[PDB]
């Protein structure tokens, strides 16, 4: 509905509904994320070196052909894996 | 803007157990090109000249 012969002061930066958009998305994000699968036992120590044609590309950066031990289905069995992780996902501790 | 990821890099999945199907990164097949974005040059000049006025 268009209005007629009416003025009004207006001020942003003090509106309350920006925080109500702020608060519910936080409560929406974790609630969508919580009841799916958890993983604690992954962050175990690991040795790691780069991938071979990483040096053969425009991207001469970091790929890290990598491996570790992980608990299996049964509690008394372990297994060997092989995977990749970027430099921005891994850091060393301060021999391989 | 157009933004792509070239290497389609197929995946694998193992089981943590009981009932935790973990997904992890598999292996590269093909060349390697890092991610990038193209942008129209002269239009970016035009709007930057527009905003500075």
């Amino acid at each position, epitope marked *: 509905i268009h209005l007629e012969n009416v003025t009004e002061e207006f001020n942003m930066w003090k509106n309350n509904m920006v925080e109500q958009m702020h608060e519910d998305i936080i409560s929406l994000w974790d609630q969508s994320l919580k009841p799916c699968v958890k993983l604690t036992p992954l962050c175990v120590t690991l040795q790691c*070196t*780069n*991938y*071979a*044609p990483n*040096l*053969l*590309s*425009n991207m001469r950066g970091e790929l890290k*052909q990598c491996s570790f031990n992980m608990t299996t289905e049964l509690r008394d069995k372990k297994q060997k894996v092989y995977s990749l992780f970027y430099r921005l996902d891994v850091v*060393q501790i301060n021999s*391989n | 803007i157009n933004c792509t990821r070239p290497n389609n890099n197929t995946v694998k999945s193992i089981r943590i157990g009981p009932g935790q199907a973990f997904y992890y990164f598999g292996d590269i*097949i*093909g*060349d390697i090109r890092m991610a990038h974005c193209n942008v129209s040059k002269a239009t970016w000049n035009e709007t930057l000249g527009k905003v500075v006025k």
Partner: antibody
Amino acid sequence: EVQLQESGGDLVKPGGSLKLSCAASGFTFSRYGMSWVRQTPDKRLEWVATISSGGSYTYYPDSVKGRFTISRDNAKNTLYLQMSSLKSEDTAMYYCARHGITTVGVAMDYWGQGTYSHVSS
Amino acid sequence: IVMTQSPASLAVSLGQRATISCKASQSVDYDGDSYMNWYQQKPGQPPKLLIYAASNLESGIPARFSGSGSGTDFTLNIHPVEEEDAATYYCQQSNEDPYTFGAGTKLELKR
């Protein structure tokens, strides 16, 4: 595991109209990379590397400029090269090799065959 | 451009120890130290890997020798030697823009 059949009859005064071809093997031809090493008498012998499928090199070293022209064919699983306008201080092209994975920098984990063909006079 | 190192054409009196070195072809190397491996050949054979991935012994050869590596300057070692060990050992390490080696050995048992 399978070595690489080669073919070289390089006996031409300095015009490098001289094709040399590689072969295939029992392993897969894609998803890897190859290189080329020649043979000089006791002076460390060549460094010419090549690419993977559609990779971003055509010349690996300096001092081969305008003369290198490596190609690759995924279809018949066999590559070849052409060394135009041949200079002196040059015996022939000799070896083929494979880069492989699970190394760090680069390595030549297999070696096809060396071919000797003196070019001049 | 590099500046590789080897003492000479070597010899051995079958005494289990033979250490040859290539200290600094160029400047230092980074955390992924990337120094590649040593190859061998004899005049009746094409070249062949000894060591892989800068540290550890190859699957395919028996467990009887290794080598040391630290940053830039290092060497090899060996452990009891025999007939087919006396050979020519080349030293390529550098992997960034060129691939290089200038070093090399000529090793033979002493009569």
